[PDB]
Write a protein that binds this ligand. Structure first.
Ligand SMILES: Oc1cc2ccccc2cc1O
Length: 222
């Protein structure tokens, strides 16, 4: 398949990304608590449902939530201010809460079943969100870094296999603050560092210029 792109909702961020996040890729956004990673996830879950002329892929979404941070009412607001019907947008987001890291890993295998079901339809899965990818692994493997890296490596390999095999954009969030971080090392296809700037602006930089945007009723925008 050709590489598809999903607009982030921000012209600035899209330019930094060469058009948007890519299918057949894992995009990892990392930054401190409150930097806007989950807002970017919510916005992408709407943007992907637009036609290509508007930066989407007419796609369905699967969302794995590890922190109970998915907000349907926020999806509705973004959809309504992106010219879409909010009920339709929500009906094309499959949502699951991961209870722990082992359940999170099983959910990725379950996602493949729905990906296959929708593959030949007019609304194939085009976006798989894992928010937060690392939170359960970090809390469960305190004092056991070697084992944590083994399990994370398999989880990321599963996510890669889905991105490439089914032409999906995988978007993952990772909280990294004071003294923290192996990030995801070199595992993602693309690492985006997100931070707060003056006056509520958010600033994005590729790790391995900078885009600037705001969080608004449209999700994010310049
Ligand atoms: O209905 C489902 C929703 C999911 C969401 C994310 C990951 C896996 C899922 C599996 C489902 O059957």
């Amino acid at each position: 398949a050709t590489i598809g792109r999903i607009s982030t909702g921000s012209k600035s961020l899209d330019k930094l990304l060469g058009g948007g996040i890519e299918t057949q890729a894992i995009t990892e956004v990392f930054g401190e608590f409150g930097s806007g990673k989950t807002q970017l996830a919510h916005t992408l879950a709407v943007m992907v449902q637009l036609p290509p002329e508007e930066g989407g892929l007419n796609g369905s979404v699967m969302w794995i939530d590890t922190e109970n941070t998915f907000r349907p009412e926020r999806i509705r607001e973004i959809a309504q201010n992106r010219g879409l019907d909010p009920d339709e947008v929500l009906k094309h987001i499959a949502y699951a809460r991961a209870f722990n890291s082992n359940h999170q890993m099983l959910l990725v295998q379950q996602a493949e079943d729905m990906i296959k079901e929708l593959l030949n339809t007019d609304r194939p899965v085009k976006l798989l969100i894992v928010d937060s990818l690392t939170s359960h692994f970090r809390s469960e493997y305190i004092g056991a870094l070697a084992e944590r890296q083994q399990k994370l490596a398999k989880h990321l390999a599963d996510l890669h296999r889905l991105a490439n095999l089914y032409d999906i954009a995988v978007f993952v969030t990772n909280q990294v603050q004071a003294n923290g971080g192996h990030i995801l090392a070199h595992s993602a296809t693309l690492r985006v560092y997100l931070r707060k700037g003056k006056g509520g602006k958010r600033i994005a930089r590729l790790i391995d210029g900078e885009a600037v945007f705001s969080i608004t009723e449209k999700g994010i925008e310049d």
